[PDB]
Design a protein around this ligand. Structure first.
Ligand SMILES: O=c1cc(-c2ccc(O)cc2)oc2cc(O)cc(O)c12
Length: 467
C-alpha cells in the first residue's frame, strides 16, 4: 500500500521526467530547426548556413548532459542538509521552472531561453537519479530492493516510451501544438508535489544524523506494514556505527591510491562504453536515423513508437533475466551482440537499394540492438559500479563514474550529427568499434561478480595490481 504508493510517486516525479526528456527532442526537431532559422533571420538578417544550424541543434540536444553533470556534483552539497524528500521537492521546483521556461520560449522568440531551460532541466536530471535510488532502497524491506531497482529502470523506460508516443503527428506533432511538448512536464511535477509530501521521510535519513527516534519508528511502521520493526532499527544503527568507525576517503586520494587503480579504470571504461555505445544517440535522433534508411516519412513516428515499446518490454524481461544469468557474461554478451547487430545494421544500410524489404531489416536490426541493450548492460553498470569497491557505496566512486557518464553523453549528443555528416552510410562503424573494444576489454579484465564477496574480487584485482 504505502510502499507501492511512495514508489510510484517518486518514480513518476523523477525518473518518468528524465525518460520523457531523454526522447522528446526528436519528434519536433524539424519545427525547432525552422524556429531557429526564423529567429536568426529576425535577429541578424542573414540565414543560417546548414552546418551552423546543425551545430546549434546539437548543442541544444546535448546540453542536457552538462546539466546532469553539474547536477551530480551539486547533489553532494544538497543532500547533506536537504535530505531526500525535501531534495526531491526542490527537484520538483527545478522541473516547474524548467518546463515553464520551455513553454514560453516559442512566443518570446529567444532561443537562449530554450538553451537555459534545457540546462536547468538537465540539472533536474542529475539531481533526480542520484536521489531517487537511495530513497527507493531506504523505504523498502530487504527482500524487495532489487525489485525497486527494476521499478526505477522500468519507469525510465516508460518515460522514454511516452516521450516517443506524445511526439506523434496527431497528438503533439502539429505546427500549432509542439510547445505543449515541453508543457506536459508540469503534470508529473504537480502530481508528485501533491503525492510525496503526504508520506513519511526516509527512516535511514532520520536515524543516521537526524536522530528522530519516534519519527524513524513511525516511518518504519508505516513503510514495512508492521509494528515490529525494532530489529531493523538496531541493524541500521549498527551499520551507522560501522560506517562512522571507518574514515572517509576523498576522490583525489582514491585516484592516487594504487590498490584501486584497476578498479577505477574498469568502472570508468564501463561507463564510457555504456554511454558511447550510442543508445542515447538513437534515442535523440531516431527520426533522422529511420528517415535515412529509406523508410517513407509517413510511418517514421509509428516505428519510433515501436522502438519505445520494445525498449520497455526488454526492460521488463531484464528485470528477471538479470537474477538468473549473471553480471559478467551478461555484460560481455550484451556488448558483443551490440557489435554484431551494429555490423548487420551497417550492412543493411550500405545496400538498402538492392531490395525493397531492406529498410524492414534496418528496423529489425535497431529493434534487436535496443533489446540487447536493455536486457543486457542496460542496468547492471549501476550495480556493479558499487560492487567493485570494498566499501561498495563510495561517494568518490559515484562522483568518478557519473562525471565520465555525463561527459560521454555530452560527446555522443554533440558529435553524432557530425559523425553522420562524415559517414552518412557508415556512421555506426564508430559505435561498433567502441562496443567491440569495450567487450574485449571487459572480457579480458572484468571477473564474475554475482554471489561473490568483496574480499575475493579484491584478491582477484590485486592479482593484477602488481602490488
Ligand atoms: O539508473 C539508471 C538507469 C538508466 C537506464 C536507461 C535505459 C534503460 O533501458 C535502463 C536503464 O540510465 C542511467 C543513466 C545515468 O546517467 C544514471 C543512472 O543511475 C541511470
Amino acid at each position: 500500500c504505502s510502499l507501492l504508493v511512495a514508489s510510484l510517486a517518486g518514480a513518476f516525479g523523477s525518473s518518468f521526467l528524465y525518460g520523457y526528456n531523454l526522447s522528446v527532442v526528436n519528434a519536433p526537431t524539424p519545427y525547432i530547426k525552422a524556429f531557429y532559422n526564423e529567429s536568426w533571420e529576425r535577429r541578424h538578417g542573414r540565414p543560417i548556413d546548414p552546418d551552423t544550424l546543425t551545430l546549434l541543434w546539437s548543442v541544444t540536444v546535448s546540453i542536457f548532459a552538462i546539466g546532469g553533470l553539474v547536477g551530480t556534483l551539486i547533489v553532494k552539497m544538497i543532500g547533506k542538509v536537504l535530505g531526500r524528500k525535501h531534495t526531491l521537492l526542490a527537484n520538483n521546483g527545478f522541473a516547474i521552472s524548467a518546463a515553464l521556461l520551455m513553454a514560453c520560449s516559442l512566443q518570446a522568440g529567444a532561443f537562449e531561453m530554450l538553451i537555459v531551460g534545457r540546462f536547468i532541466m538537465g540539472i533536474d536530471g542529475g539531481v533526480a537519479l542520484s536521489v531517487l535510488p537511495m530513497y527507493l532502497s531506504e523505504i523498502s524491506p530487504k527482500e524487495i530492493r532489487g525489485s525497486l531497482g527494476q521499478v526505477t529502470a522500468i519507469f525510465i523506460c516508460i518515460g522514454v516510451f511516452t516521450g516517443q508516443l506524445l511526439g506523434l503527428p496527431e497528438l503533439l506533432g502539429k505546427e500549432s501544438t509542439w510547445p505543449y511538448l515541453f508543457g506536459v512536464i508540469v503534470v508529473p511535477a504537480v502530481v508528485q508535489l501533491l503525492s510525496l509530501p503526504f508520506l513519511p521521510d526516509s527512516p535511514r535519513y532520520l536515524l543516521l544524523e537526524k536522530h528522530n527516534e519516534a519519527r524513524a519508528v513511525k516511518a518504519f511502521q508505516t513503510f514495512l506494514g508492521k509494528a515490529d520493526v525494532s530489529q531493523e532499527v538496531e541493524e541500521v544503527l549498527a551499520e551507522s556505527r560501522v560506517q562512522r568507525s571507518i574514515r572517509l576517503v576523498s576522490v583525489l586520494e582514491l585516484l592516487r591510491a594504487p590498490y584501486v587503480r584497476w578498479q577505477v579504470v574498469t568502472v570508468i571504461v564501463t561507463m564510457a562504453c555504456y554511454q558511447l555505445c550510442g543508445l542515447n544517440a538513437i534515442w535523440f535522433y531516431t527520426n533522422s536515423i529511420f528517415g535515412k534508411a529509406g523508410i517513407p516519412p509517413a510511418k517514421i513516428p509509428y516505428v519510433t513508437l515501436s522502438t519505445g515499446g520494445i525498449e520497455t518490454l526488454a526492460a521488463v524481461f531484464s528485470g528477471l533475466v538479470i537474477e538468473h544469468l549473471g553480471r559478467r557474461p551478461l555484460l560481455i554478451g550484451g556488448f558483443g551482440l551490440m557489435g554484431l547487430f551494429f555490423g548487420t545494421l551497417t550492412i543493411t544500410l550500405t545496400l538498402q537499394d538492392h531490395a525493397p524489404w531492406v529498410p524492414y531489416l534496418s528496423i529489425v536490426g535497431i529493434l534487436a540492438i535496443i533489446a540487447s541493450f536493455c536486457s543486457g548492460p542496460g542496468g547492471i553498470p549501476f550495480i556493479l559500479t558499487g560492487e567493485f569497491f570494498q566499501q561498495s557505496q563510495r561517494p568518490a566512486a559515484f562522483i568518478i563514474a557519473g562525471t565520465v557518464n555525463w561527459l560521454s553523453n555530452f560527446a555522443v549528443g554533440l558529435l553524432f550529427p557530425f559523425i553522420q555528416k562524415s559517414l552518412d552510410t557508415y556512421c555506426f562503424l564508430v559505435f561498433a568499434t567502441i562496443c567491440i573494444t569495450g567487450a574485449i576489454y571487459l572480457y579480458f579484465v572484468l571477473p564474475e561478480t554475482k554471489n561473490r564477496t568483496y574480499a575475493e574480487i579484491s584478491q582477484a584485482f590485486s592479482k593484477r595490481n602488481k602490488a
